[PDB]
Design a protein around this nucleic acid. Sequence first.
RNA 1: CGAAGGUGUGCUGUGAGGCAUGCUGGAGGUAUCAGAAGUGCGAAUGCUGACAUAAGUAACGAUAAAGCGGGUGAAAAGCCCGCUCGCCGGAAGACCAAGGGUUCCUGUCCAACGUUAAUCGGGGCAGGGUGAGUCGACCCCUAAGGCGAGGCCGAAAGGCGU
RNA 2: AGGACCGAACCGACUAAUGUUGAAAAAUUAGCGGAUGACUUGUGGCUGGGGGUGAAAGGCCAAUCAAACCGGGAGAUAGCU
RNA 3: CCCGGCGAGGGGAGUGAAAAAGAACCUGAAACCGUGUACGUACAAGCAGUGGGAGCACGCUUAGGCGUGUGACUGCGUACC
RNA 4: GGUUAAGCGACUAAGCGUACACGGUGGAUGCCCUGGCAGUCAGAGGCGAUGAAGGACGUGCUAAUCUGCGAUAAGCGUCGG
Lengths: 46, 117, 56, 120, 110
Amino acid sequence: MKRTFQPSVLKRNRSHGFRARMATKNGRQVLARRRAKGRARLTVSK
Amino acid sequence: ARVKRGVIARARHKKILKQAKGYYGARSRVYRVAFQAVIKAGQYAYRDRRQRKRQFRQLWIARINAAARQNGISYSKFINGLKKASVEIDRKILADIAVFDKVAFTALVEKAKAALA
Amino acid sequence: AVQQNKPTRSKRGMRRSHDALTAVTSLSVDKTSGEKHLRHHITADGYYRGRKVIAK
Amino acid sequence: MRHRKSGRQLNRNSSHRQAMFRNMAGSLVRHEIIKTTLPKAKELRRVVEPLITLAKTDSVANRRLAFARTRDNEIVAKLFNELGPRFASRAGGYTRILKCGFRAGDNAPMAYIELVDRSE
Amino acid sequence: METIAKHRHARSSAQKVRLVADLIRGKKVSQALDILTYTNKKAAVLVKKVLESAIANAEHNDGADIDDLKVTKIFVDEGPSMKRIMPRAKGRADRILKRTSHITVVVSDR
RNA sequence: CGAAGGUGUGCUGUGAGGCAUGCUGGAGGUAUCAGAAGUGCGAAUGCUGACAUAAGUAACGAUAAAGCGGGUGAAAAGCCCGCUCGCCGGAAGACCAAGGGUUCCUGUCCAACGUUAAUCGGGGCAGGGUGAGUCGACCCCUAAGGCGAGGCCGAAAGGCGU
RNA sequence: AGGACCGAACCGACUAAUGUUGAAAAAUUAGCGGAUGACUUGUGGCUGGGGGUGAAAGGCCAAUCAAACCGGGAGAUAGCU
RNA sequence: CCCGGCGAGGGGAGUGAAAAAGAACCUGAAACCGUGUACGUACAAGCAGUGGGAGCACGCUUAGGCGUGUGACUGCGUACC
RNA sequence: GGUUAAGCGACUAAGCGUACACGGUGGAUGCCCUGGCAGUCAGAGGCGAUGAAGGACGUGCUAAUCUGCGAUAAGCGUCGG
Ligand SMILES: [Mg+2]
Ligand SMILES: [Mg+2]
Ligand SMILES: [Mg+2]
Ligand SMILES: [Mg+2]
Ligand SMILES: [Mg+2]
Ligand SMILES: [Mg+2]
Ligand SMILES: [Mg+2]
Ligand SMILES: [Mg+2]
Ligand SMILES: [Mg+2]
Ligand SMILES: [Mg+2]
Ligand SMILES: [Mg+2]
Ligand SMILES: [Mg+2]
Ligand SMILES: [Mg+2]
Ligand SMILES: [Mg+2]
Ligand SMILES: [Mg+2]
Ligand SMILES: [Mg+2]
Ligand SMILES: [Mg+2]
Ligand SMILES: [Mg+2]
Ligand SMILES: [Mg+2]
Ligand SMILES: [Mg+2]
Ligand SMILES: [Mg+2]
Ligand SMILES: [Mg+2]
Ligand SMILES: [Mg+2]
Ligand SMILES: [Mg+2]
Ligand SMILES: [Mg+2]
Ligand SMILES: [Mg+2]
Ligand SMILES: [Mg+2]
Ligand SMILES: [Mg+2]
Ligand SMILES: [Mg+2]
Ligand SMILES: [Mg+2]
Ligand SMILES: [Mg+2]
Ligand SMILES: [Mg+2]
Ligand SMILES: [Mg+2]
Ligand SMILES: [Mg+2]
C-alpha cells in the first residue's frame, strides 16, 4: 500500500528546513528550543 | 536518609524459604508460593496439636477394646468396672499394658469384672 | 488453545522421557580394510564388503 | 491409502519427476556412478534399466524411443554402442546401489548408484 | 587424573546438546568417538571436538594412555542468550532467543 | 591474625529478630545511649531488568523446480565451473527520474547479520572506483504560488500587497 | 460525434474463498466495474483544528478524527475502582 | 606448548596475594537450567501440607527406643490477596 | 533331600520428586566515586556588524571520534611565570 511517508528532499527542506524555520518568529523559537535542548541536528537540512 | 531494602528483604524471604524445605516445586523455591505454604503448615500444625490428642486416645481406646474383648469384656464395661474399682490408670497406659504386658491387662480385666459383679 | 496453568519441571521431563537418542547399537567392521562403518553402508575410504567400490 | 501402488512422488509434480529422472538417467549413463539420495536412486533403477534393456536391440525405432526418454543423443549412442553390448548377457540388474551415509546440509540418506561393470 | 575440556558459548541449545551428551556419559573414550561419529546431530560435531580436545589435554598435559580413558562426567550448561527481534504479522515484534551452551567433558583414567 | 556483603550451621528470644561460628569475600564496619527518616512489599491488568512456560511445538515468506559431474574447502542441496532441466520475457529484461548513499569492483574474513549450512553475500575489514564547453544541475526566462523596499492595515506579535 | 459500445495498460473494488499471532496493522487468488473522461497520473503549490476540505460517508486532514498532533496549564478533577 | 578450521573455545605453562581477579573480568544473591549422590516413586485419585509413622541411607554414641536426609502407609485438610 | 501345591515376597526407574554437594545462567547485595542534588560566602551579571549564540567543513607523522585550533589551523608572536 502507499504509506504516509513519500520522501522529497525539496519538500523536506521547504517545509522543515533551516530557512523555513528562520522565516517565521515561531520557527526561530523552534531552533531556540532545540539549541537549548542541545540538539546535534537542529534541522532536517542535509 | 535513603534506605535500601535488599539485605533485609533477602533475609526475610530466606527465612520463609528455609521453612519451606521439602515442599514440592515452587512451594520450596518461590517466596509467593512458599509463604502461603508455610502459613498453611503452621495453621495445620496448630490444628493438629489438638487432633493428635484426639487421634491417640482413639488409638488407645481401640487397643483396650481389642485386649478387653480377648479377655471377655467390652471396653465400655471395662472402663466402668475400673471406675467402680477406683482404678485411675489412663488409656495411654492401659493400651501400653495391653500390648506389652498381657498378663497385667488380664488382671485389670478381672478387677473390672469384679467391680461389676 | 493455551494453558490455564504453567506446566511443571516434572511434566516437561516426563514428555522428554521419549526424546533420548538411540546410539548406533554396533558398528560393522570391513573384512579387507579393518574400517568401522555403518552396516550396509560403505566405508569412509570407499570400501564396502571387501571391495573398494569408489575411485578415491 | 496406497495399496499396491508403485512410484515415489518425491514431493514433486509428475512433470518435474519425469524431467529429473531423464536428467539423472543421462547423468548415470554418462558418468557410470552418481551420488544421489537413496529414494531417488531406487526410482532411477526403474528408469535406467529399461533403457539399457531397450539398448540391447539396436534399431532406429529403439534409438528413437530412447531419445524420447533421454533427449540426449550422446546417451542414446552410449546406451546402444557401449551399455547394450556390455549388458547383452545380463538378465537385469544393470545397476548397483551403494549406501554411502548422510548429507551434511539436510541429513538425507545418500547412495551411490553404479552400473555394475564400470571397469574405469 | 580428571582432565577437562570445554566449549563455551557454543551455538546450540543445551537441550539439543544434552541429547548427545547423554549418549557418551560413562563410556570408554574410543566408544564415545564412534557413537558421535555416527550420531546425525550438529551437537555430535560439537561434543566430539570437545571430547577430542579433552583426550589430547589428558595426553599432553596430564599423562598418557588413551585406552584407559573413560568419559567420567559430561554436562551442558546454558550460556548467555543472544536476543533478536523477529517481526510478526500486524507490527507485533517477537523477541526470539538464540540460545547458546557451555559443553564440558571430563575424561579420566582412574 | 580478615570488615561489609554472600552462603551454611548451631544456639537463643512471646514475636518482629538476636548472638556465635565454618566457607566464600578481600576493606571497610560500628557498641551504647540519644537523634533524624526516601524505614520494612506479595498483590496495585504496578515499574525496570532477568529468567521460565507453552516447545524443541508452530513456522523458515508466493507450489517458477530442480538433477548430476567437477572444483575449492575443516565441512558443499544452497558458492564457483560445466552439462542438462524448468520460470519470466509489454518482464521476473534493459535505461532513468524520485528516493537512498558506497549497497559498485577487487582482495580477504565467517563471530554476529542471512529465518538452514555457507567456502557465498547488499554481512565484517581493507584497498580501489564516479574524469564533460556539448548529458544534467548551476545559469537566462517565467507559471501556480512564495517572500516583499516603501506602502495600506493591525493591542503587540503580525496581516495584505506595489 | 459520443460523461457511446467491447476490451488490455491505467484507475477502481461487486462477490467468493484463503488469510485472521497474516507474506500483508486491509493483502492474495479467481472472477468483477470504469477504461477520451464529471477520466487518470507525475512534479510543485495553496487551504490548519471549532479550523480546513468534503459529488456529504461526520468522510478525510501523516496506520490517530462528533474536533488532529506536539508541548504546556498539569500532580486538571475522579463522592469511583 | 597442546586439541581445534593458520577458527571460536578450551587445557597446560607462566604473571600475580589471588586468574574460584583472564578482559563475557571486585563481590557474585534469587528466579531459572543442569551433573552427581542418598532415599522415595510405575494398582495410584484432589491446595500437595500437617499430625502420626515404618523402612532405607548417613553421621554420633560406647549399649541406650539420639542428629541429619528420605518417606511407604495412615488421620485431618478445597491456595493467597 | 527332590518334586508339586499353596501362601507371602525383595531386587526394575523410561522418567519424576525431596534433600545435599558441585556448577551454569543472571547481575541483586555490599563496598567504591572522576558524576549529580541542595545550599553558603564571594564574584561576574551580559555576548554581538571590531560579525555573537550556535553550527558546517577543515586542521596532526593520523583511518576514525573527542578536545583544541582556523588555510599562520592540537597552533604564530611578545611580555611574564
Ligand atoms: Mg509540505
Ligand atoms: Mg517437504
Ligand atoms: Mg508492516
Ligand atoms: Mg498485601
Ligand atoms: Mg515469554
Ligand atoms: Mg502441542
Ligand atoms: Mg504438529
Ligand atoms: Mg511444520
Ligand atoms: Mg523461501
Ligand atoms: Mg558498508
Ligand atoms: Mg557486490
Ligand atoms: Mg560454523
Ligand atoms: Mg548461518
Ligand atoms: Mg560488502
Ligand atoms: Mg506579502
Ligand atoms: Mg516594510
Ligand atoms: Mg465509455
Ligand atoms: Mg498482486
Ligand atoms: Mg483482482
Ligand atoms: Mg470497458
Ligand atoms: Mg449518520
Ligand atoms: Mg488516517
Ligand atoms: Mg476532544
Ligand atoms: Mg509552555
Ligand atoms: Mg491525575
Ligand atoms: Mg587458543
Ligand atoms: Mg566476578
Ligand atoms: Mg557468573
Ligand atoms: Mg506400587
Ligand atoms: Mg492425579
Ligand atoms: Mg537415565
Ligand atoms: Mg534425580
Ligand atoms: Mg557504609
Ligand atoms: Mg561564531
